[PDB]
Amino acid sequence: HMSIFSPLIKKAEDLAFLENEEALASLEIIGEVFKAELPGSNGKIIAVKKVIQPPDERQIRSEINTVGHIRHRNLLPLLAHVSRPECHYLVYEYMEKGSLQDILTDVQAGNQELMWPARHKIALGIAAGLEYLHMDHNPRIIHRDLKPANVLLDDDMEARISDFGLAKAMPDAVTHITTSHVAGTVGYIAPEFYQTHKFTDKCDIYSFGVILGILVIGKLPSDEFFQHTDEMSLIKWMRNIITSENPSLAIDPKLMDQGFDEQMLLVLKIACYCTLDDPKQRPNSKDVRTMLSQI
Numbered sequence: 001h002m003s004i005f006s007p008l009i010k011k012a013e014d015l016a017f018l019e020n021e022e023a024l025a026s027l028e029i030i031g032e033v034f035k036a037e038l039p040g041s042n043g044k045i046i047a048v049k050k051v052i053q054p055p056d057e058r059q060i061r062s063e064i065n066t067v068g069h070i071r072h073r074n075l076l077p078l079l080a081h082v083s084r085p086e087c088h089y090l091v092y093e094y095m096e097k098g099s100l101q102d103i104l105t106d107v108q109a110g111n112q113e114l115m116w117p118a119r120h121k122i123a124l125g126i127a128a129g130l131e132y133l134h135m136d137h138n139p140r141i142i143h144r145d146l147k148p149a150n151v152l153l154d155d156d157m158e159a160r161i162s163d164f165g166l167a168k169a170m171p172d173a174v175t176h177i178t179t180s181h182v183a184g185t186v187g188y189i190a191p192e193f194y195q196t197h198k199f200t201d202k203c204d205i206y207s208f209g210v211i212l213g214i215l216v217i218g219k220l221p222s223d224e225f226f227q228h229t230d231e232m233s234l235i236k237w238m239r240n241i242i243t244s245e246n247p248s249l250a251i252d253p254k255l256m257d258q259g260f261d262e263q264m265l266l267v268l269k270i271a272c273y274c275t276l277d278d279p280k281q282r283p284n285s286k287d288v289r290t291m292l293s294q295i
């Protein structure tokens with residue numbers, strides 16, 4: 001029925017509202033991800049992600065149990081998993097800071113700012129989480145869906161990677177590519193995936209490299225600016241500017257000429273290495289974290 005992975009949920013009946021349909025209809029939709037108040041706790045807020053059972057469905061439960069035991073400073077812990085005949089519910093803590101996607105989008109609109117030290121802290125957090133998943137957890141965990149929407153910020157402004165591990169939660173490759181086009185996140189899919197249809201650690205490295213590039217450029221891969229550029233993609237445009245006469249032009253003008261230019265150019269080079277067309281040319285998560293910390 002349901003597996004409890006965190007002491008924050010005292011009783012299982014506290015999640016009974018998840019099996020009430022008309023109670024779910026009233027919940028706020030923050031993502032599908034609902035937002036509710038934990039009944040057992042004294043005002044703790046939880047985010048409940050709803051995934052559809054695959055038509056395959058037996059391995060996702062073992063994968064969820066594996067995810068429920070993973071704990072890292074830069075990984076979003078899974079509090080509980082509720083299993084219904086129609087769908088699965090993954091319970092996380094609600095992070096009022098939001099995701100990196102929301103923060104960067106609001107930074108574009110001028111309703112928010114994000115300094116370079118904070119971005120470097122976020123990048124180091126994502127590197128630590130990716131390295132723990134790739135090279136430290138006893139079974140190697142592949143994210144398969146790394147993007148700024150699956151990286152949240154806690155009250156320490158630390159990165160926390162989410163929505164990882166579930167191999168069976170993913171659709172087929174064609175459906176994944178089409179729905180990532182509609183969602184505007186195809187820029188994080190490595191080139192090799194169009195020929196291999198298989199998720200590897202190097203695909204997560206490519207996604208991380210696109211995120212690293214975003215953190216300096218200040219623009220998303222879905223930006224129409226790249227559709228009005230010669231390279232027609234964020235990665236190729238960045239790759240050309242890094243070796244151009246003036247690489248500093250790739251820096252977000254909000255972060256420019258504030259004493260962090262060389263550091264941002266270094267992480268741009270790191271992202272360039274993380275986004276090479278050949279996966280064997282890309283570095284592993286440990287090397288990425290070491291290079292990010294060498295600044």
Ligand SMILES: Nc1ncnc2c1ncn2[C@@H]1O[C@H](COP(=O)(O)OP(=O)(O)NP(=O)(O)O)[C@@H](O)[C@H]1O
Binds near residue numbers: 095
């Ligand atoms: N633990 C969480 N805490 C607070 N907000 C969250 C949390 N998880 C998700 N959200 C919000 O829900 C949005 C994304 O939810 P989600 O259903 O995962 O869509 P997605 O990431 O774009 N696609 P995918 O994860 O591949 O299915 C984010 O922008 C968050 O604002």
Ligand SMILES: [Mg+2]
Binds near residue numbers: 149150162163
């Ligand atoms: Mg998500």
